[PDB]
């Protein structure tokens, strides 16, 4: 069970995360998101984000086989399992929107 | 061409994929879906790293925190500070100046 120490540190990390999220929100409103994201994310991390969008899209579409996900997107079985679990755990508003925007 | 066709084709596919992510997140913010989208797209440790990198950038721009404090408070050793400082130097000055206004506002 978490202690006051661990709870304090977790809340501090949460606030730091929200500060990043808000900084990026504002960057988008001032057309500075692209250079901000180049500063805050390494190239391989940006590549991972682009690929993960594809994985999510293709999991929702349901047409690509597991072998095709691996060959085309580099997503092996464990990554598909994790990604599927993230989708299942996402709030309904996010899943509905992703279906609307990624499969349109 | 700057790159051979194999490398160029893969780079342009990655670029298109990146822009798709950027646009998706742009719209998520507008729809108040940014938090769940980022929880889907980033692992917990990756989210923590982004929170910490904001603090490193802030403290590098502020100039007050020492090298030892950067390591002991923010996990940033000498090499990481050098890398981060290099990213700031490479960024457009417009971004740097905006970061100073936002992050050092107080
Ligand atoms: O260089 C790294 O290890 C990751 C990284 C990406 N953007 C940064 C900004 C400040 C400090 C570290 C990083
Ligand atoms: O599970 C991972 O290794 C990384 C990851 C985070 N969000 C994802 C969405 C889809 C596929 C993989 C990931």
From Swiss-Prot, chain B:
This is Trp operon repressor. InterPro entries: Trp_repress (IPR000831), Trp_repress_bac (IPR013335), Trp_repressor/repl_initiator (IPR010921), TrpR-like_sf (IPR038116). Belongs to the TrpR family. Gene3D superfamilies: TrpR-like. It is found in: Cytoplasm. It holds the Pfam family Trp_repressor. The gene is trpR. This protein is an aporepressor. When complexed with L-tryptophan it binds the operator region of the trp operon (5'-ACTAGT-'3') and prevents the initiation of transcription. The complex also regulates trp repressor biosynthesis by binding to its regulatory region. Residues 67-90 bind DNA. GO terms for biological process: negative regulation of DNA-templated transcription; regulation of DNA-templated transcription. NCBIfam families: TrpR. Coiled coil: none annotated. Homodimer. Keywords: Cytoplasm, DNA-binding, Repressor, Transcription, Transcription regulation. One of its GO terms (molecular function) is DNA-binding transcription factor activity. Its main location: cytoplasm. GO terms for cellular component: cytoplasm. It comes from Escherichia coli (strain K12).
């Amino acid at each position: 069970q978490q202690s006051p120490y661990s709870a304090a540190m977790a809340e501090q990390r949460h606030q730091e995360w929200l500060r990043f999220v808000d900084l990026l929100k504002n960057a988008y409103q001032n057309d500075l998101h692209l250079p901000l994201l180049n500063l805050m994310l390494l190239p391989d991390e940006r590549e991972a984000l682009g690929t993960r969008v594809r994985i999510v899209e293709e999991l929702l579409r349901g047409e690509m086989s597991q072998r095709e996900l691996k060959n085309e997107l580099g997503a092996g079985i464990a990554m598909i399992t994790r990604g599927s679990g993230y989708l299942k755990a996402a709030p309904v508003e996010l899943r509905q929107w992703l279906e609307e925007v990624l499969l349109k």
